[PDB]
């Protein structure tokens, strides 16, 4: 087409979606990861994760307001990935990399799994 | 912090949100602009428009599934701006620029109003 494009638009949208999450505005699901609860927007979760895409496109599960994750999932790993979904920034550290990679494999976040594998390979 | 950042993440999220809109997945509002209806996600509308931010943060209006816009609003102008919200690309043409600018002023989309004013100034 003959369109013009605003370079910063996608980043500005994501920043605003994170501000809505912070202020608990229009969050429509609670993700339970053992004893912890995380509020989020179903659409952002689906846009970032192959697992959430499959869950919320399912005719029965799309209507649930609470989703319980597998008990093997580490809440800190999930928290780091949820922050990544809303900000593009991944808080990857020697002390959390294995939990983050395991959580990203479960959530089906291929780009995160890729960077974790590379950082692990560099340590070996 | 000591974060790493995935450059393409925000653009990839927006592309996926537009794919959900296309497939009518988890759209939760209908915007009525005279005889036309547009389905969208409340969170994306709020992230892009000062008008929708004010509407969906209001305790009564946040619960509405249908929003009727002012009858002076042109449906084509709205359609062009809705596509911009979901893609960062603005289909600005000599034949639609006045309707687009008027709609962006009403929706409170300051960056769109700015580019329309500049293209109009260049024509004069």
């Amino acid at each position: 087409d003959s369109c013009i494009q605003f370079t910063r638009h996608a980043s500005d949208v994501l920043l605003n979606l994170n501000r809505l999450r912070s202020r608990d505005i229009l969050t429509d699901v609670v993700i339970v990861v053992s004893r912890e609860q995380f509020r989020a927007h179903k659409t952002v979760l689906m846009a970032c994760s192959g697992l959430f895409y499959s869950i919320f496109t399912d005719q029965l599960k799309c209507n649930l307001s609470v989703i319980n994750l597998d008990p093997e999932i580490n809440p800190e790993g999930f928290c780091i990935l949820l922050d990544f979904m809303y900000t593009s920034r991944l808080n990857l550290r020697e002390g959390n990399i294995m939990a983050v990679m395991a959580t990203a494999m479960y959530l089906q976040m291929e780009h995160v799994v890729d960077t974790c594998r590379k950082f692990i390979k560099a340590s070996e | 912090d000591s974060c790493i950042q995935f450059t393409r993440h925000a653009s990839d999220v927006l592309l996926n949100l537009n794919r959900l809109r296309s497939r009518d997945i988890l759209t939760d509002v209908v915007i009525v602009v005279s005889r036309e209806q547009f389905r969208a996600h409340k969170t994306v509308l709020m992230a892009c428009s000062g008008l929708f931010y004010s509407i969906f943060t209001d305790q009564l209006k946040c619960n509405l599934s249908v929003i009727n816009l002012d009858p002076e609003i042109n449906p084509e102008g709205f359609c062009i701006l809705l596509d911009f919200m979901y893609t960062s690309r603005l289909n600005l043409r000599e034949g639609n620029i006045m309707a687009v600018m008027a709609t962006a002023m009403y929706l409170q989309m300051e960056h769109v109003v700015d580019t329309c004013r500049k293209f109009i100034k260049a024509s004069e």
């Binding site: 369109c3 013009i4 494009q5 605003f6 370079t7 | 690309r89 603005l90 580019t115």
Partner: peptide, 4 residues
């Protein structure tokens, strides 16, 4: 704004 840019030409994409």
């Amino acid at each position: 704004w840019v030409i994409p």
